[PDB]
UniProtKB/Swiss-Prot annotation:
Protein name: Peptide deformylase
PANTHER family tied to this protein: PEPTIDE DEFORMYLASE (PTHR10458:SF21)
Catalytic activity: N-terminal N-formyl-L-methionyl-[peptide] + H2O = N-terminal L-methionyl-[peptide] + formate
Keyword Lyase attached: no
Role according to the record: Removes the formyl group from the N-terminal Met of newly synthesized proteins. Requires at least a dipeptide for an efficient rate of reaction. N-terminal L-methionine is a prerequisite for activity but the enzyme has broad specificity at other positions.
GO biological process: co-translational protein modification; translation
Highest taxon, organism lineage: Bacteria
Organism: Escherichia coli (strain K12)
An example molecular function term from Gene Ontology annotations: ferrous iron binding
Length: 147
């Protein structure tokens, strides 16, 4: 159930996503496919732009517990701390994983695939991935700082 995934180079991956004022059934389908894809990609997280949606919608798959199943809509960063660097690849890139620097822990606000905006604190792999999707969907990508 994978939608249309955009690959680097791609304007939409480098495109800034806009966080919608309200979760529409169209927006819900977008996330639903985003996970469906991301998983189909076996990715630990997929960002809206990646799946061809120029809207700040993020879906996570970081086993921060027993079963992976994180969804956030129009997430925004609230706080970041610590400096990390870990290799990863992007659904847009052909699995070319590189070590990208991001904060060690970060707390961000988002709404669930159900349509309820809440604030969640992310640390480690959670904080890294969630913050990464924020960047990716805002058209910013780790490659922007790789060299
Ligand atoms: C909720 C967001 C979670 C982080 C997403 C990352 C990188 C990405 O493409 N973000 O848009 C991802 O899962 N990377 C995967 C991958 O290359 N690796 C393998 C190890 C885990 C992950 C990052 O290194 C690919 C398959 C999508
Ligand atoms: Zn990515």
């Amino acid at each position: 159930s994978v939608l249309q995934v955009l690959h680097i180079p791609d304007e939409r991956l480098r495109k800034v996503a806009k966080p919608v004022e309200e979760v529409n059934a169209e927006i819900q389908r977008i996330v639903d496919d985003m996970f469906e894809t991301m998983y189909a990609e076996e990715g630990i997280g997929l960002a809206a732009t990646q799946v061809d949606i120029h809207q700040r919608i993020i879906v996570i798959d970081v086993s921060e517990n027993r079963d992976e199943r994180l969804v956030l809509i129009n997430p925004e960063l609230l706080e970041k701390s610590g400096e990390t660097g870990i290799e990863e690849g992007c659904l847009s890139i052909p699995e070319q994983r590189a070590l990208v620097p991001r904060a060690e822990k970060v707390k961000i606000r988002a709404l669930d695939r159900d349509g309820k905006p809440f604030e969640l604190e992310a640390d480690g792999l959670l904080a890294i991935c969630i913050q990464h999707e924020m960047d990716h969907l805002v058209g910013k990508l780790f490659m922007d700082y790789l060299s």
